[PDB]
């Protein structure tokens, strides 16, 4: 059975373990706990990996790092990365504008002065989500009837710059409701239930946004869930 | 024919005009100076792109935007992606380790603390190399026999470290072999010796490093390229 290993936090990861639920794909983690670094490099050079990282895919005969390398192998095993070069560039843009959002976050959450620092990510991000809202006007998903691996990204994303700003989406009910619809998609409601969902850290436990073990206060605000926020997969 | 719009910079765009030019590929460009920017955001909105922004890409089959997006589909037309799932992760995983090296640039050229901030990229730096070191072993490109999008996606990293360490290189023998390998295809020699190579600026203008309007002194390491270090084009 395939296995994917990252560290025990949602980060990088996340958007994969959603599509891997999503396809009801059967597949084993290896969790690195916080103060498990060290276990980490003692095998980042003996698990035959190119080009060393995390997170890691390993199934049969496939042994990748590169997260969206990893996501979209495991779409394009079921024929979902598009079925012309049109298409296939429709997916990989929608995949690049997700990617602007969660990474703005990401560039932010680890510095001393974040609370000065998000104030103008935060007055970007509308310009940011309109898009995605404009884009959800008569699309179920992005691109359309069919469920593609952005969708579980810019759920991803969601649900990130949610707890940084509870009302980002006040403005964007499209977008409300496209992240109700994933919940209610049935194996992932199920999952985010399971005992196998990481509710938190968004980002590394040493961010100054979306860090440590548990989520503390004046961010942990994004309804629809099952809980596990003390990581609970291990 | 296809109207790939930038900054008259490299950025993000370079991979993509170098891969253009490997196929010979006629287009035309829509280059915004230095002083250009509020003629792009009188524009960004009246260009029917679903997710305005720079670069762009307009043919007569799409409008798009994301740079990967766009590199990727200009290589899709060409049969350039993979012919499985595997080969297409293989290379999606080359295209990642690539931006880890690009982007580490980019996340810190803007700040004024990068003198200092360097230190810690350019302490991560040869690992990474050593990668694609160990990848070129027994191969004339990152896939073998062929060219794929991820060799020009290299080859503008390599372009922008050498900069930032005119001795990042020395001790790489196959990297320093394939960026000559890949100076030497007819198609780029005469690009990089045109009027239409854009030499500098590596980042935006107005960046800590790779800014400005000419390369800065000593450090400049990259020949085989045509001189303008300003830029010239339009
Ligand atoms: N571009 C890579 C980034 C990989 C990366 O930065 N991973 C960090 C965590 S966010 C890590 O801990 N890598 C393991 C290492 O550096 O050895 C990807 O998308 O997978
Ligand atoms: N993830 C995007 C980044 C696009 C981006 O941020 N472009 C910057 C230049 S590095 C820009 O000036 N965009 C035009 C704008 O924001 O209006 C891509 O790879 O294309």
Chains 1, 2 share one sequence.
Request: aromatic letters at 12%; proline letters at 6%; hydrophobic letters at 35%.
């Amino acid at each position: 059975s395939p296995i994917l290993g990252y560290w025990k936090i949602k980060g990088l990861v996340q958007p994969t373990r959603l599509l891997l639920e999503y396809l009801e794909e059967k597949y084993e983690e290896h969790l690195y706990e916080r103060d498990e670094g060290d276990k980490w490099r003692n095998k980042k050079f003996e698990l035959g990996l190119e080009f060393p990282n995390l997170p890691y895919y390993i199934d049969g005969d496939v042994k990748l790092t590169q997260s969206m390398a990893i996501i979209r192998y495991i779409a394009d095993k079921h024929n979902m990365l598009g079925g012309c070069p049109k298409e296939r560039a429709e997916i990989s843009m929608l995949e690049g504008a997700v990617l602007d959002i969660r990474y703005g976050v990401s560039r932010i959450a680890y510095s001393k002065d974040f609370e000065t620092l998000k104030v103008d990510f935060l007055s970007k991000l509308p310009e940011m989500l309109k898009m995605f809202e404009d884009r959800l006007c008569h699309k179920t998903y992005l691109n359309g009837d069919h469920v593609t691996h952005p969708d579980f990204m810019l759920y991803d994303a969601l649900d990130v710059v949610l707890y940084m700003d509870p009302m980002c989406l006040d403005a964007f009910p499209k977008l409300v409701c496209f992240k109700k619809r994933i919940e209610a998609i049935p194996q992932i409601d199920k999952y985010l239930k399971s005992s196998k969902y990481i509710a938190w850290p968004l980002q590394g436990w040493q961010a100054t946004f979306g860090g440590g073990d548990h989520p503390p206060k004046s961010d942990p605000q994004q309804h629809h869930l099952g809980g596990a926020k003390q990581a609970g997969d291990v």
